[PDB]
Design a protein around this motif. Structure first.
Motif, PDB file in Angstrom:
ATOM      1  N   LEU A  27       7.611   2.665  -0.156  1.00  0.00           N
ATOM      2  CA  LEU A  27       6.734   3.830  -0.174  1.00  0.00           C
ATOM      3  C   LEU A  27       6.434   4.279   1.250  1.00  0.00           C
ATOM      4  CD1 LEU A  27       6.059   2.290  -3.079  1.00  0.00           C
ATOM      5  CD2 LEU A  27       3.922   3.600  -2.938  1.00  0.00           C
ATOM      6  N   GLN A  28       7.338   3.895   2.154  1.00  0.00           N
ATOM      7  CA  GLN A  28       7.162   4.246   3.584  1.00  0.00           C
ATOM      8  C   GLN A  28       8.399   5.010   4.054  1.00  0.00           C
ATOM      9  OE1 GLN A  28       6.302   0.524   2.842  1.00  0.00           O
ATOM     10  NE2 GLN A  28       4.576   1.768   2.147  1.00  0.00           N
ATOM     11  N   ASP A  29       8.275   5.737   5.158  1.00  0.00           N
ATOM     12  CA  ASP A  29       9.371   6.519   5.719  1.00  0.00           C
ATOM     13  C   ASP A  29       9.494   6.251   7.214  1.00  0.00           C
ATOM     14  OD1 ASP A  29      11.416   8.516   6.058  1.00  0.00           O
ATOM     15  OD2 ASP A  29       9.867   9.944   6.672  1.00  0.00           O
TER      16      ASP A  29
END
Lengths: 252, 229, 119
Positions: free
Chosen positions: A151-153
């Motif tokens: 859920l991270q970029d």
């Protein structure tokens, strides 16, 4: 009399009547009963000046504009000369009792009572005590706790008092577990310690084995029974050898 | 100092001169002038000293109450007054003369409706605490400390947020300095008041940040660590 | 007395009531022209004046303390009118009023300080 000086700081044969004239008093008597009068000291000194002034008086003794004309009532005989009657014919009032008779015409058609007059056509300081906006205390939550789980970029990131207590207090507890002493019960107990009533036996033997406070309570009971004339104490004759040789003899 | 001691009448022209020339000199020069006036008080004695007490310092603090914060001289005035409040502990008896000076002027400054002058009054008050009167008895000691208790209670119950924030920081300094002195019932009541209610003041965030500015310097209190925990 | 009862609602309306009654009380003409045989009459007039004004002071001071306490409690803007009127009460008498206000508490010190400011 400090006020006597205070009268003198400004600069007997007389009768002074207090209250409303009911009482009669001489000056030396009047001034001195009032010096202890039923007032506060500020009110008492006030009454005392009023007496001095009233006594001293007896010793010394021995623009308009013009008036409006309508404010004057007319003469009575004139009102008799012009009376006003009714539909029935009875006289009800006079003609001068009403003011439209005294009204004065105008070229415009107006009416006035008085024709005489005007015809109509860096080191300055703050000013104290200025209330401003006071935002009051309000209670609530500015906060949010979301439990998203349970859920991270990359590119976005890349760019001796104590001794006194110790010595005396155990004696205080020792007094607290002293035996409870009542005078009648202790007297009966000491009598029962004897073999029989009115029998001589050493009282020191009867208190033998008791503690010191119980022995002292027993001799206090013996002293009380002796002083009430009921029980007789028999001691040895003399001063110092009479000790521990008393005996209670229950007479009454 | 001996020029001040020389002529009593010249002191008012000195007061006018230092009124004229506060703006020029810097902060270190202000605390230097404050040292001069502290030693000037100390050397002075007699009726000249009484006239100085009735002349100089009360007018300066009256101005510093009533000067706007827009004025830069106002900063100089309360910083030299804070120097005086720091020096009152050094010499004994200074507390009594500032008490007899502040018996008229502190009390109506407490209830000053204007928020700025009451904020300056609170700023001087929180360092002013505790105030002592030597001749008064133990009843009057307990009465004056309870008077200060209700005074700080009302000042922390202020409706304005910034006056509240200054009161918070002041009682934080009080509870840091002399927590051993206050009765524990008063201490528990004040900590419960400033914790149960004050942490959730939704009107302003920076008042809670002022509580945050307070929290490290109360943590030196060794005995109250379970109580704060 | 109705003001110092506190039964009245104290507000900005009551602020205007209190304030303009203060400049009613602080009027110059409220005192008699007598203090503003005939010389004896003037003498007894001013002695009557001292005793009535001290009776007036001992009546007003307790209710003044009560009303000023509830007035500063409400932050009513008539307090400047309070410290206006009470100081012309203070320039009535200079030292004996300081003694009577030493019987009273927490009012005199600010009064000598403003009086010094008036000189």
């Amino acid at each position: 009399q400090p006020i006597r000086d205070l009268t003198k700081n400004w600069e007997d044969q007389i009768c002074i009547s207090f209250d409303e004239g009911k009482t009669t008093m001489n000056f030396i008597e009047a001034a001195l009963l009032i010096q202890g009068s039923a007032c506060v000291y500020s009110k008492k000194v006030e009454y005392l000046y009023s007496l001095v002034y009233q006594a001293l008086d007896f010793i010394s003794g021995k623009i308009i504009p013009l008036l409006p004309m309508a404010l004057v009532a007319p003469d009575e005989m004139e009102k008799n000369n012009n009376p006003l009657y009714s539909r029935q014919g009875e006289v009800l009032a006079s003609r001068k009792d009403f003011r439209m008779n005294t009204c004065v015409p105008h070229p415009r058609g107006a009416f006035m009572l008085e024709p005489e007059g005007m015809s109509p056509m860096p080191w300055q300081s703050l000013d104290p005590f200025d209330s401003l906006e006071s935002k009051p205390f309000k209670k609530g939550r500015p906060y949010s706790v979301p439990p998203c789980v349970e859920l991270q970029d990359f590119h976005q990131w890349y760019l001796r008092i104590r001794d006194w207590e110790d010595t005396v207090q155990p004696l205080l507890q020792e007094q607290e577990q002293h035996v409870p002493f009542d005078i009648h019960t202790y007297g009966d107990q000491l009598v029962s310690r004897f073999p029989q009533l009115n029998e001589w036996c050493p009282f020191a033997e009867l208190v033998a084995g008791q503690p010191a406070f119980e022995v002292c309570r027993s001799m206090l009971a013996s002293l009380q029974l002796a002083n009430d004339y009921t029980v007789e104490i028999t001691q040895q004759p003399g001063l110092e050898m009479a000790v521990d040789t008393m005996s209670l003899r229950l007479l009454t | 100092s001996c020029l001040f001691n020389w002529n009593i009448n010249f002191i008012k022209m000195i007061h006018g001169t230092i009124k004229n020339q506060l703006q020029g000199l810097q902060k270190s020069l202000m605390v230097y002038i404050a040292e001069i006036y502290f030693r000037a008080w100390k050397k002075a004695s007699g009726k000249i000293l009484e006239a100085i007490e009735n002349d100089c310092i009360q007018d300066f603090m009256f101005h510093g109450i009533h000067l706007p914060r827009r004025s830069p001289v106002h900063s100089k005035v309360r910083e030299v007054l804070s120097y005086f409040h720091h020096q009152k502990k050094v010499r004994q008896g200074v507390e009594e003369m500032l008490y007899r000076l502040y018996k008229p002027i502190l009390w109506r400054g407490l209830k000053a409706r204007n928020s700025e002058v009451r904020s300056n009054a609170a700023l001087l008050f929180v360092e002013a605490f505790p105030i002592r009167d030597p001749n008064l008895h133990a009843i009057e000691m307990d009465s004056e400390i309870q008077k200060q208790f209700e005074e700080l209670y009302s000042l922390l119950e202020d409706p304005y947020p910034m006056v509240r924030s200054t009161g918070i920081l002041g009682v934080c300094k009080i509870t840091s300095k002399y927590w051993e002195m206050m009765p524990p019932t008063i201490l528990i009541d004040l900590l419960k008041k400033v914790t149960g209610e004050l942490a959730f003041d939704t009107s302003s965030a920076d008042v809670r940040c002022s509580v945050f500015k307070c929290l490290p310097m109360i943590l030196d209190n060794k005995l109250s660590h379970p109580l704060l925990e | 007395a109705c003001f110092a009862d506190g039964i009245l609602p104290l507000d900005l309306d009551a602020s205007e009531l209190l304030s303009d009654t203060f400049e009613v009380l602080s009027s110059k003409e409220i005192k008699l022209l007598a203090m503003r045989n005939v010389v004896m009459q003037e003498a007894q007039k001013k002695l009557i004046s001292q005793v009535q004004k001290r009776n007036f002071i001992e009546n007003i001071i307790p209710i003044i303390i009560s009303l000023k306490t509830v007035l500063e409690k409400n932050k009513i803007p008539a307090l400047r009118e309070l410290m206006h009127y009470l100081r012309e009460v203070m320039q009535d008498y200079r030292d004996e009023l300081k003694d009577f206000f030493a019987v009273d508490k927490q009012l005199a010190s600010e009064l000598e300080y403003d009086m010094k400011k008036y000189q």
